[PDB]
Scaffold this motif. Structure first.
Motif, mmCIF file in Angstrom:
data_model
loop_
_atom_site.group_PDB
_atom_site.id
_atom_site.type_symbol
_atom_site.label_atom_id
_atom_site.label_comp_id
_atom_site.label_asym_id
_atom_site.label_seq_id
_atom_site.Cartn_x
_atom_site.Cartn_y
_atom_site.Cartn_z
ATOM 1 N N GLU A 150 -1.126 -10.156 -5.668
ATOM 2 C CA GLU A 150 -1.227 -8.701 -5.539
ATOM 3 C C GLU A 150 -0.630 -8.184 -4.235
ATOM 4 O O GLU A 150 -0.582 -8.891 -3.227
ATOM 5 C CB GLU A 150 -2.673 -8.231 -5.743
ATOM 6 C CG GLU A 150 -3.593 -8.344 -4.517
ATOM 7 C CD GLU A 150 -3.869 -9.780 -4.026
ATOM 8 O OE1 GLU A 150 -3.638 -10.768 -4.753
ATOM 9 O OE2 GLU A 150 -4.375 -9.940 -2.894
ATOM 10 N N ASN A 152 -1.005 -4.359 -1.837
ATOM 11 C CA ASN A 152 -1.672 -3.067 -1.669
ATOM 12 C C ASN A 152 -0.724 -1.902 -1.993
ATOM 13 O O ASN A 152 0.454 -1.923 -1.633
ATOM 14 C CB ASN A 152 -2.169 -2.948 -0.217
ATOM 15 C CG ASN A 152 -3.364 -3.829 0.103
ATOM 16 O OD1 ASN A 152 -4.095 -4.269 -0.785
ATOM 17 N ND2 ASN A 152 -3.601 -4.025 1.390
ATOM 18 N N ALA E 160 -11.385 -4.724 -0.128
ATOM 19 C CA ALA E 160 -10.610 -3.632 0.470
ATOM 20 C C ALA E 160 -10.735 -2.277 -0.271
ATOM 21 O O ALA E 160 -9.733 -1.674 -0.644
ATOM 22 C CB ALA E 160 -9.157 -4.116 0.607
HETATM 23 C C1 LIG Z 1 -4.877 -4.502 1.887
HETATM 24 O O1 LIG Z 1 -5.164 -3.599 2.997
HETATM 25 C C2 LIG Z 1 -6.398 -3.878 3.762
HETATM 26 C C3 LIG Z 1 -6.590 -2.861 4.900
HETATM 27 O O2 LIG Z 1 -5.511 -1.864 4.969
HETATM 28 C C4 LIG Z 1 -4.275 -2.365 5.599
HETATM 29 O O3 LIG Z 1 -4.544 -2.677 7.020
HETATM 30 C C5 LIG Z 1 -3.413 -3.181 7.845
HETATM 31 C C6 LIG Z 1 -3.561 -4.696 7.984
HETATM 32 C C7 LIG Z 1 -2.052 -2.668 7.327
HETATM 33 O O4 LIG Z 1 -1.540 -3.534 6.278
HETATM 34 C C8 LIG Z 1 -2.238 -1.270 6.724
HETATM 35 O O5 LIG Z 1 -0.932 -0.706 6.429
HETATM 36 C C9 LIG Z 1 -3.091 -1.356 5.438
HETATM 37 O O6 LIG Z 1 -3.513 0.000 5.104
HETATM 38 C C10 LIG Z 1 -6.346 -5.309 4.305
HETATM 39 O O7 LIG Z 1 -7.644 -5.551 4.973
HETATM 40 C C11 LIG Z 1 -7.637 -6.404 6.171
HETATM 41 O O8 LIG Z 1 -7.802 -7.802 5.769
HETATM 42 C C12 LIG Z 1 -7.820 -8.770 6.887
HETATM 43 C C13 LIG Z 1 -7.866 -10.185 6.309
HETATM 44 O O9 LIG Z 1 -6.712 -10.394 5.472
HETATM 45 C C14 LIG Z 1 -9.015 -8.438 7.790
HETATM 46 O O10 LIG Z 1 -8.995 -9.298 8.961
HETATM 47 C C15 LIG Z 1 -8.898 -6.993 8.289
HETATM 48 O O11 LIG Z 1 -10.044 -6.693 9.138
HETATM 49 C C16 LIG Z 1 -8.779 -5.987 7.129
HETATM 50 N N1 LIG Z 1 -8.510 -4.652 7.676
HETATM 51 C C17 LIG Z 1 -9.030 -3.532 7.191
HETATM 52 C C18 LIG Z 1 -8.583 -2.236 7.886
HETATM 53 O O12 LIG Z 1 -9.781 -3.527 6.217
HETATM 54 C C19 LIG Z 1 -6.139 -6.299 3.152
HETATM 55 O O13 LIG Z 1 -6.090 -7.653 3.665
HETATM 56 C C20 LIG Z 1 -4.855 -5.982 2.356
HETATM 57 N N2 LIG Z 1 -4.794 -6.872 1.204
HETATM 58 C C21 LIG Z 1 -3.686 -7.167 0.538
HETATM 59 C C22 LIG Z 1 -3.895 -8.010 -0.714
HETATM 60 O O14 LIG Z 1 -2.571 -6.772 0.877
#
Ligand SMILES: *[C@@H]1O[C@H](CO[C@@H]2O[C@@H](C)[C@@H](O)[C@@H](O)[C@@H]2O)[C@@H](O[C@@H]2O[C@H](CO)[C@@H](O)[C@H](O)[C@H]2NC(C)=O)[C@H](O)[C@H]1NC(C)=O
Ligand SMILES: *[C@@H]1O[C@H](CO)[C@@H](O[C@@H]2O[C@H](CO)[C@@H](O[C@H]3O[C@H](CO)[C@@H](O)[C@H](O)[C@@H]3O)[C@H](O)[C@H]2NC(C)=O)[C@H](O)[C@H]1NC(C)=O
Ligand SMILES: *[C@@H]1O[C@H](CO)[C@@H](O[C@@H]2O[C@H](CO)[C@@H](O)[C@H](O)[C@H]2NC(C)=O)[C@H](O)[C@H]1NC(C)=O
Ligand SMILES: *[C@@H]1O[C@H](CO)[C@@H](O[C@@H]2O[C@H](CO)[C@@H](O)[C@H](O)[C@H]2NC(C)=O)[C@H](O)[C@H]1NC(C)=O
Ligand SMILES: *[C@@H]1O[C@H](CO)[C@@H](O[C@@H]2O[C@H](CO)[C@@H](O)[C@H](O)[C@H]2NC(C)=O)[C@H](O)[C@H]1NC(C)=O
Ligand SMILES: *[C@@H]1O[C@H](CO)[C@@H](O)[C@H](O)[C@H]1NC(C)=O
Ligand SMILES: *[C@@H]1O[C@H](CO)[C@@H](O)[C@H](O)[C@H]1NC(C)=O
Ligand SMILES: *[C@@H]1O[C@H](CO)[C@@H](O)[C@H](O)[C@H]1NC(C)=O
Ligand SMILES: *[C@@H]1O[C@H](CO)[C@@H](O)[C@H](O)[C@H]1NC(C)=O
Lengths: 194, 340, 48, 48, 182, 48
Positions: A150, A152, E160
């Motif tokens: 997948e 986002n 997420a």
């Molecule tokens: C999908 O997105 C979430 C959070 O939003 C993104 O955050 C940034 C990393 C950047 O990509 C932005 O443009 C997006 O809007 C991701 O959540 C993170 O996951 C990691 C572990 O993988 C975790 O350490 C972080 O704390 C999370 N951050 C938040 C803000 O929730 C998620 O991993 C993405 N997933 C995929 C499948 O792409």
């Protein structure tokens, strides 16, 4: 898709070529019916309050007046030992009769058709299933589409172009960050919002 | 989903503290083992039934701390962090409405010897060999599997039932639902406030109902009742003469010699054995009753909680949208949500 | 001899599979007897 | 052992009637002059 | 009192632990009985006080093993019994199991199910291998020994979610699984 | 039992002998009912 499928079926062969672990569901039914026959047989060793476990050892030793006082003990003991076995076999037959009605249901719905029922034809979205036989049972090789990689996406529940609202006939709206698209709910293929 | 696990000291039930009686009981062979094994086949499949209904997700989904669900209010059915078990407000309603006689909740003899040897059925069951056993999953672990099923649902819809969870905005998701029962998805967004107000109001009616009455959980209470009633009857079956001089073994054995006691004692060995051979049968059949209920509940989980069902009236009366599982003593409660 | 030896003896197998298994319940035997009755001193009128 | 009430019944018969003294019997002794109950708790002691 | 003994009162031969009852027997009472019709209290006849009777401390025994194919080490569950009593189950009185080799202790652990011996409590949680009960499980692992642990239900994961975000699969797998019904 | 008829036994012998014979009728029947009721309980489960 075919190369994943031939590889998945390859993993089924390569896995069940290594071990008995998966067949515990058939092997246990066999074990249990064998156990109950061993138990029913082994009861003949028992005195049940008679002078002997062995019938000929009563007859080869007692007169009719006494022998009946020994033999009815044997009858009582063995009788209850059959009744218990027959009870266990009826109740265990009910466990299997359900297992058969379920197997016939999985055959009708996962073999003769494609089921929309979640997890009935296994975890993932059912495509088709192939039956294979086994000693006293059936095996199903359920093929499932599983969404696996997948990305986002940003989304909106509707779009505005001339003050009117727009919705997908089929699918959902998404943005790659720069342009909006519409796509089918279970796979990313973007298209222009027309 | 389950019933109380049990096991019987078959020797101590029939022959409690006597060598003389054990040496008579031996003359029947495997009877006590066959009884013990059968109780074990039941007890072991209760851990199965618990597992198969609840342990359907191998990943423990946690909710976001914010609640931007578009006006739908799961606060009464999500975990409440303030409580020592992480159960929801409605689950803490459901957990109060059922009376249980123990569940394995540490008997350590600092209570159950002395004073509380007398005024407790269960300590007498434990003194006649009638050991209830704790389930493999604690109610916190059921609450966590339930929380994970519910948190997965409200954040990802059916997608975790197929594979990895895919996030979707709730209002939109409900649009896919509505589209599955053929009311086209615009009709949700054009009414989202009214829908949310009704969904929250319908959760309000579940509360106001199941709080007020003292009877509602009958289909669970009757199981918890029949378990204890059968053990309490099996305990009464020790009080019978079966034609013998006394229903106490040691009051025969102190009063009689090695042969007159063999005539008496075998009466009790008979009557009592037929009392376990009855009880264990009654449990093996009930167990087949609860098994069917549990396998059905594991299908209601698979098809009303992990997905939307097109099966009419299977997910309660109406067109199904979605359902929320709740832990209960020995049970699952579905909260079905329907378009009507 | 030991808990494994009771389990082999119980399953009537010389080889035991992976699992959890039932064995003969334990119960502390009494250390010694206690006898207690009312104290009477005259004997009953058997000669009468 | 201990006993809550005790009684002795003292009488004379011929020896050929001692078999009639046991519980649930028949014969003129056991029918017309000394009957024991069907559960009789006690013991029977006879001598020439 | 508090010890296990072959009591007799009046020919009421039993076996148990005698204890001072809090029962106010009325002056005519000498016995109390269980709902089961068995004695569970009795006035001492030389010295008029009321004794509770409890049949001596006891329970089921059960054994945990990785298989003979790999090891001859086993761990043992005293189901429904706090660990202190297990010392009280010393062979200076004759227990129904004559084997008493595990009352050495050192790895003794209390659980909701009873007291567990020969297995080590590890804080790390795993998949349930042998089910002990009440969220405890046991396994033979690394220098191999039996460990006992509270089980891990699965990986914890915060999804997420947000009021405007969607995940979509860019790729898939075509899985096949077996399923075997008798 | 010497008869399947409950009053033939009561006529031919006495109470002690009834403990020998009427008792048989008690046992055998009570096994009969437990047999029917079990068959009916299993059967009932199929009909459910
Ligand atoms: C999908 O997105 C979430 C959070 O939003 C993104 O955050 C940034 C990393 C950047 O990509 C932005 O443009 C997006 O809007 C991701 O959540 C993170 O996951 C990691 C572990 O993988 C975790 O350490 C972080 O704390 C999370 N951050 C938040 C803000 O929730 C998620 O991993 C993405 N997933 C995929 C499948 O792409
Ligand atoms: C979001 O997806 C869009 C579609 O893939 C993408 O826009 C596309 O970008 C390519 C270049 O990368 C354009 O290609 C044209 O580029 C110039 C334009 O003058 C021409 O000379 C070339 O011949 C070629 O035709 C596409 O036309 C363009 N399409 C659209 C509808 O925008 C975006 O870049 C993607 N955004 C992100 C953030 O990835
Ligand atoms: C979701 O609904 C619950 C009640 O059903 C709301 O929580 C209540 O909030 C009010 C106002 O502060 C308090 O008076 C109540 O005591 C709260 N009840 C409980 C059980 O906590 C909650 O605020 C609602 N959520 C939203 C986003 O509106
Ligand atoms: C066995 O362990 C339990 C603890 O699990 C002990 O119970 C405690 O006893 C003290 C003193 O009576 C109380 O203050 C605690 O509140 C009790 N806690 C619990 C959980 O029971 C018990 O005393 C121990 N028994 C023995 C014989 O050591
Ligand atoms: C979708 O996933 C499949 C694998 O499941 C990808 O196919 C593999 O692609 C790599 C190169 O990227 C090759 O080395 C492998 O041999 C391919 N596997 C098979 C079974 O042929 C595929 O490239 C992915 N496609 C997208 C759109 O991401
Ligand atoms: C038993 O004897 C002691 C003295 O030996 C005395 O204290 C007690 O009163 C006697 N028992 C009764 C019931 O009087
Ligand atoms: C157990 O023994 C079998 C042979 O009987 C062998 O194939 C297997 O690898 C062994 N496993 C272990 C863990 O020793
Ligand atoms: C396990 O963790 C606790 C803290 O939760 C700690 O007190 C204890 O010492 C740890 N046990 C071991 C064996 O390290
Ligand atoms: C999302 O919710 C926040 C409040 O939590 C709000 O400020 C924001 O405008 C919302 N955005 C969308 C796209 O709904």
């Amino acid at each position: 898709i075919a190369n994943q499928f031939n590889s998945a079926i390859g993993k089924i062969q390569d896995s069940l070529s290594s071990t008995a672990s998966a067949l515990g569901k058939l092997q246990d039914v066999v074990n249990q019916n064998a156990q109950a026959l061993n138990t029913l047989v082994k009861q003949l060793s028992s005195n049940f309050g008679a002078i002997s476990s062995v019938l000929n050892d009563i007859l080869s030793r007692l007169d009719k007046v006494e022998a009946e006082v020994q033999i009815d003990r044997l009858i009582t003991g063995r009788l209850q030992s059959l009744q218990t076995y027959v009870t266990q076999q009826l109740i265990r037959a009910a466990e299997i009769r359900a297992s058969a009605n379920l197997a016939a249901t999985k055959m009708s719905e996962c073999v003769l058709g494609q089921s929309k029922r979640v997890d009935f034809c296994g975890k993932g979205y059912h495509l088709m299933s192939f039956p294979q036989s086994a000693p006293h049972g059936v095996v199903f090789l359920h093929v499932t589409y599983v969404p696996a990689q997948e990305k986002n996406f940003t989304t909106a529940p509707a779009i505005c172009h001339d003050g009117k609202a727009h919705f997908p006939r089929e699918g959902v709206f998404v943005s790659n960050g720069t342009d909006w698209f519409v796509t089918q709910r279970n796979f990313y293929e973007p298209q222009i919002i027309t | 989903v389950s019933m109380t696990k049990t096991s019987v000291d078959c020797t101590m039930y029939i022959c409690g503290d006597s060598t003389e009686c054990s040496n008579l009981l031996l003359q029947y062979g495997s009877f006590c083992t066959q009884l013990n094994r059968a109780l074990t086949g039941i007890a072991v499949e209760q851990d199965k039934n618990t597992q198969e209904v609840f342990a359907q997700v191998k990943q423990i989904y946690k909710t976001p701390p914010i609640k931007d669900f578009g006006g739908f209010n799961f606060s009464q059915i999500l975990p409440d962090p303030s409580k020592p078990s992480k159960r929801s407000f409605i689950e803490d309603l459901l957990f109060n409405k059922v009376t249980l006689a123990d569940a394995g909740f540490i008997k350590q003899y600092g209570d159950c010897l002395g004073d509380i040897a007398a005024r407790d059925l269960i300590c007498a069951q434990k003194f006649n060999g009638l050991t209830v056993l704790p389930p493999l999953l604690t109610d916190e672990m059921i609450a966590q599997y339930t929380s994970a099923l519910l948190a997965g649902t409200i954040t990802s819809g059916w997608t975790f039932g197929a594979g990895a969870a895919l996030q979707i905005p709730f209002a939109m998701q409900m649009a896919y639902r509505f589209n599955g029962i053929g009311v086209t998805q615009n009709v949700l967004y054009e009414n989202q406030k009214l829908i949310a107000n009704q969904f929250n109001s319908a959760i309000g009616k579940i509360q106001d109902s199941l709080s007020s009455t003292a009877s509602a959980l009958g289909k669970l209470q009757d199981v918890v009742n029949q378990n204890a009633q059968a053990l309490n009857t099996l305990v009464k079956q020790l009080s019978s003469n079966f034609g013998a001089i006394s229903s106490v073994l040691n009051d025969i054995l102190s009063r009689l010699d090695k042969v007159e006691a063999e005539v008496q004692i075998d009466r009790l060995i008979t009557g009592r054995l037929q009392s376990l051979q009855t009880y264990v049968t009654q449990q093996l059949i009930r167990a087949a009753e609860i098994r069917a209920s549990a396998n059905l509940a594991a299908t209601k989980m698979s098809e009303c909680v992990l997905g939307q069902s097109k099966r009419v009236d299977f997910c309660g009366k109406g067109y199904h949208l979605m359902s929320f599982p709740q832990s209960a003593p020995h049970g699952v409660v579905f909260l079905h949500v329907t378009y009507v | 001899l030991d808990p494994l030896s009771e389990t082999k003896c119980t399953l009537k197998s010389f080889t035991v599979e992976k699992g959890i298994y039932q064995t003969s319940n334990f119960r502390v035997q009494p250390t010694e007897s206690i006898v207690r009755f009312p104290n009477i001193t005259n004997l009953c009128p058997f000669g009468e | 052992l201990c006993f809550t009430n005790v009684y002795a019944d003292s009488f004379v018969i011929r020896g050929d009637e001692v078999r009639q003294i046991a519980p649930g019997q028949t014969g003129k002794i056991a029918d017309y002059n000394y009957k024991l109950p069907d559960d009789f708790t006690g013991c029977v002691i006879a001598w020439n | 009192k508090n010890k296990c003994v072959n009591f007799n009162f009046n020919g009421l031969t039993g076996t148990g632990v005698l204890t001072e009852s809090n029962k106010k027997f009325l002056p005519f009472q000498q016995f109390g009985r269980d709902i089961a019709d068995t004695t569970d209290a009795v006035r001492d006849p030389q010295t008029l006080e009321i004794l509770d009777i409890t049949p001596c401390s006891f329970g089921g025994v059960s054994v945990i093993t990785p298989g003979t194919n790999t090891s001859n080490q086993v761990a043992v569950l005293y189901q429904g019994v706090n660990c202190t009593e297990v010392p009280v189950a010393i062979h200076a009185d004759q227990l129904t199991p004559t084997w008493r080799v595990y009352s050495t202790g050192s790895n003794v652990f209390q659980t909701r199910a009873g007291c567990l011996i020969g297995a080590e409590h590890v804080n790390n949680s795993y998949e349930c291998d042998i089910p002990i009960g009440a969220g405890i499980c046991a396994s033979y692992q690394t220098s191999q020994s039996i460990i006992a642990y509270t089980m891990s239900l699965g990986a914890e994961n915060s999804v997420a979610y947000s009021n405007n975000s969607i995940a979509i699969p860019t790729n898939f797998t075509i899985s096949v699984t077996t399923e075997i019904l008798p």
